[PDB]
Amino acid sequence: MDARAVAKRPRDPADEDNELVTALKAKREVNTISVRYLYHADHQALTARFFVPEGLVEFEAQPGALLIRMETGCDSPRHLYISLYLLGIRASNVSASTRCLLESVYTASAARAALQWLDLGPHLLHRRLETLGCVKTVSLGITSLLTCVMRGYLYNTLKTEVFALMIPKDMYLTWEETRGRLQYVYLIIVYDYDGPETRPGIYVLTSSIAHWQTLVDVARGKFARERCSFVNRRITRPRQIPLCTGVIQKLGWCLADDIHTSFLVHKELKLSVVRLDNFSVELGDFREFV
Amino acid sequence: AMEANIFCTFDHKLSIADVGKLTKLVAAVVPIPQRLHLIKHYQLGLHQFVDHTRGYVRLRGLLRNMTLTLMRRVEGNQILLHVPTHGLLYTVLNTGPVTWEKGDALCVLPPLFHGPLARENLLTLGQWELVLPWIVPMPLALEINQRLLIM
Amino acid sequence: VVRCVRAQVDLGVEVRAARCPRTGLWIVRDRRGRLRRWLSQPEVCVLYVTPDLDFYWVL
Amino acid sequence: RVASGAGLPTSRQTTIMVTKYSEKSPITIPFELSAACLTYLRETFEGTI
């Protein structure tokens, strides 16, 4: 209220002590627990923690990978937390050599069950799947307890070193010959409405385009064949209901200079990846386009 | 060290039973027509918009532009409300009829159950009945919209 | 490959064959990988035979 | 070792080295504090009793 207190400078949070420090200091005792510096206090990255069975956590022990929950009409295990690579197993976009590579590592009773639940129901994938963000730490227990982030950067505790985002080469997709200073990274599930297969194409779009109309124009321009396949399935097969030939959502934005080619190793199996070092997640809902 | 909040008051008298009923809704969502600072109790929720002739669609149209808030604390002096902001986490009550899971996209809906009910008997004053909007997962909201439109 | 304007036929043509994704029709290609383009030429005609001994005759 | 008799395959002077490792097992406890004790721990109003 006073002009001294109003024009007083704002208080540094790192200079003032914790509530526990002043609480212990008031009654003046001592505990064996060191309390004077609380960890994770200066953490803008709001995180969450997820239990998941052992059969899905391979190629995840290295930090930095997507995580997607699904829905299944069965009641008790109803939501599986599938990694992006097990999602890419199902996708028709990936090369068959890499497909037989990363299927050979994911031989588990939970992974094949998730693969059956992907293609069992009548729903398409975009009405079924739901992102969570990228993962930063593992637990590697008998069941695994991963730590994903909803918003913010990807870093180790104490912020000693930043965590990168990994994506396989086949899901990587750019639409410009040179990049801007900033570029967003998206998710694309495009639907081939073909007779024999309905397996989609999975992509990430490291593009410098933020506006949705100027993004969806280039999205239609690069995926004209898929919309032509959609309208061909519309005219050839009557009384069918096709919808959302491609879907699009925002995943984050990168530094546009640390993007480089590295590789993941799990059980001496190389898997080449595009790696984005200083990256912050930024989630959004599944918009669609036809 | 205080935070920017909204001081809502009540012109009716409040029983200790009604205060104990109100303190059950700590992390409850409340829509507010305009984020003032000293608001009365007449603009908490949707009882300003309960109409005999109007329906669900105008309630959804108003709720698209309402200023949603959260409660902080209840006192015999006054009531504390908190406006949320983007990119921060908050505790929020599941007053909706459907349980949730982790990572589910949630959105706010006008109440389907209307008027007097065994669940709508919350903070009911003389001319006032505090009503709260539902917090439903997103695909159930889409299903409710489609089914209500086709009905 | 029978070429009528030059009266020259062809006996041994090795050709790779596949199906289009959009339609069930066939696509023929060179054993290197080059697309075979004689089907546009109107004066020529071709006979295809498969390893399971089916038979096509394409004008 | 021990010296051997006649016509018997004797012993040879051998050593053996062996390591041993540490095994970690961290333990943890969560404990909660409400917003009420947080907003009442370092905050006084009117100086009332």
Interchain contact A19–D (C-beta under 8 A) = yes
In angstroms, the separation between the Cα of residue A134 and the nearest Cα of chain B is 13
Cβ atoms within 10 A of the Cβ of A82, count? 24
Which residue type is seen at B106? L
Cβ–Cβ under 8 Å, residues A86 and A115: yes
Q: Is A127 on the interface with B (CB under 8 A)?
A: yes
- Residue A230's alpha-carbon distances to A187, A237, A248, in angstroms, are 20, 10, 17
* C-alpha distances out from residue A86 to A72, A204, A247, A285, C38, Å: 16, 16, 19, 21, 44
Nearest chain A residue to B90, by CA: A46
Do residues A163 and A47 make contact, with C-beta atoms less than 8 angstroms apart?
no
B55 neighbors B47 (Cβ within 8 angstroms): no
Backbone φ and ψ of A138, nearest 5°: -110, 170
Rounded to 5 degrees, what are φ and ψ at A169?
-65, -35
Contact A182, A175 (CB under 8 A): no
Write down the residue that tokens 């006032």 correspond to.
Answer: B128
Q: How far apart are CA B122 and CA A262, in angstroms?
A: 59
A52 touches chain B (CB under 8 A): no
User: Which token pair is D24?
Assistant: 């970690």
SS3 A105: helix
Bridge partners of A81, per DSSP, are A69
CB environment B97-131: b (16+ within 10 A), e (fewer): eeeeeebbeeebbbbeeeeeeeeeebbebeebbbb
Name the DSSP letter for residue A136: E
Nearest CA in chain D to B91: D35
Q: Indicate the burial class of A26 (C-beta count within 10 angstroms; 0-12, 13-18, 19 or more).
A: exposed
Residue C5 neighbours by CB under 8 Å, 6+ apart: C43
* Tokens, residue A73: 């009409």
Give me the sign of the Cα torsion angle A215, A216, A217, A221: positive
From chain D, pick out residues whose CB is under 8 angstroms from the CB of A19. Answer: 38, 41-42
Question: Encoding tokens for residue A276?
Answer: 């984005």
Structural contact between residues C9 and C3, judged by C-beta atoms closer than 8 angstroms:
yes
The kind and range of the H/E element at A118 are helix A109-120
Tell me whether chains D and C touch (3+ CB pairs under 8 A): no
Q: Which residues contact B48 (CB under 8 A, 6 or more apart)?
A: B33, B42
- DSSP lists the bridge partners of residue A185 as A206, A252
The Cβ of residue A154 has, within 10 Å, a number of other Cβ atoms equal to: 25
How many angstroms separate the CA atoms of B32 and B9, rounded? 13
Method: cryo-EM
Say how far apart CA B36 and CA B46 lie, in whole Å: 17
Q: Which A residues, 152 through 211, put their C-beta within 8 Å of a C-beta on chain B?
A: none
> Tokens 């960890």, residue?
A39
Of C54, C11, C48, give the one whose Cα is nearest residue C27. C48
Q: Does D17 lie at the interface with A, CB-CB under 8 angstroms?
A: no
Contacts of A209 (CB under 8 A, 6+ apart): A184, A215, A218
Q: In angstroms, what is the resolution?
A: 4.0
User: B123 CB contacts (<8 Å, ≥6 apart)?
Assistant: B18, B21, B22, B129, B130
What is the amino acid identity at position A91?
A
